[PDB]
Each structure stands twice: as C-alpha cells, then as structure tokens.
Amino acid sequence: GSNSGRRSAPPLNLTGLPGTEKLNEKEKELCQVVRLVPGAYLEYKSALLNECHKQGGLRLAQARALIKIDVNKTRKIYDFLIREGYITKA
Numbered sequence: 001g002s003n004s005g006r007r008s009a010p011p012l013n014l015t016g017l018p019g020t021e022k023l024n025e026k027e028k029e030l031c032q033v034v035r036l037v038p039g040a041y042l043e044y045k046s047a048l049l050n051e052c053h054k055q056g057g058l059r060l061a062q063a064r065a066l067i068k069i070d071v072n073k074t075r076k077i078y079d080f081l082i083r084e085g086y087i088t089k090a
Contacts, residue, residue, distance in 0.1 A: 014038060027080070034076045044069070044077055045086070052087040059090045 009015030010032045014023070019038020023031065031041050044067035051066060052058040063078030064071065081087040 030076060030080050034073055036073070036077070040069075041077060044074075045081065048078065048081060049086055052081075056088075057090045058087060 005021040006016065010020075010028050012032050012035050014020050014028065014032055014037070017038045019040075019042045020028065021038075022042065023038050027041065027045075030036070031038065048058070048063060048066065051062075055062075060075060060078050060082070064074040067074050067077070078087070082089045
C-alpha cells in the first residue's frame with residue numbers, strides 16, 4: 001500500500017478539503033487553529049510571496065490589507081511567513 005493523504009484528519013473543516021493534501025504538518029495546524037481553508041490559504045500564501053518579493057519590504061499592515069480576510073486571521077497567516085522566512089517584515 002502507500003500514503004493516502006488522509007491521516008487522522010485534523011480538527012475543524014480541513015480533512016479532505018482541496019489543498020490539505022498539500023498543506024504541511026505546520027501550515028495545517030495554522031489554518032485549523034485559524035479555521036482557514038486549504039486553497040484559500042494556499043492562495044494568499046502564494047500571492048503574498050510574489051507581491052512581497054516584488055515590493056520587497058512588506059509588513060503586517062500590507063498583509064491585513066492585501067488579504068484582508070479578517071483581523072487576526074491575516075496576522076496569523078502573515079506572522080507565519082514572516083517569522084518562518086517566506087517573506088520579510090520591512
């Protein structure tokens with residue numbers, strides 16, 4: 001047999017959603033705790049990476065504005081790429 005991409009299914013809605021099959025063990029908990037969606041987060045994560053590299057020097061404010069899905073919701077997604085290293089904080 002081989003991997004199935006199902007595992008024990010994380011909490012909230014994100015066990016067989018479109019993208020969780022790629023969500024890493026880290027991003028998974030980040031979206032689950034924030035109740036986010038796979039494709040949704042996968043999108044903002046990609047756009048933020050391209051824009052941040054284009055403008056170079058994007059901070060949290062730009063995140064809550066570009067992907068203004070909410071208040072702490074964007075702060076958690078951005079604080080992840082920022083502290084992780086995917087993007088920078090000015």
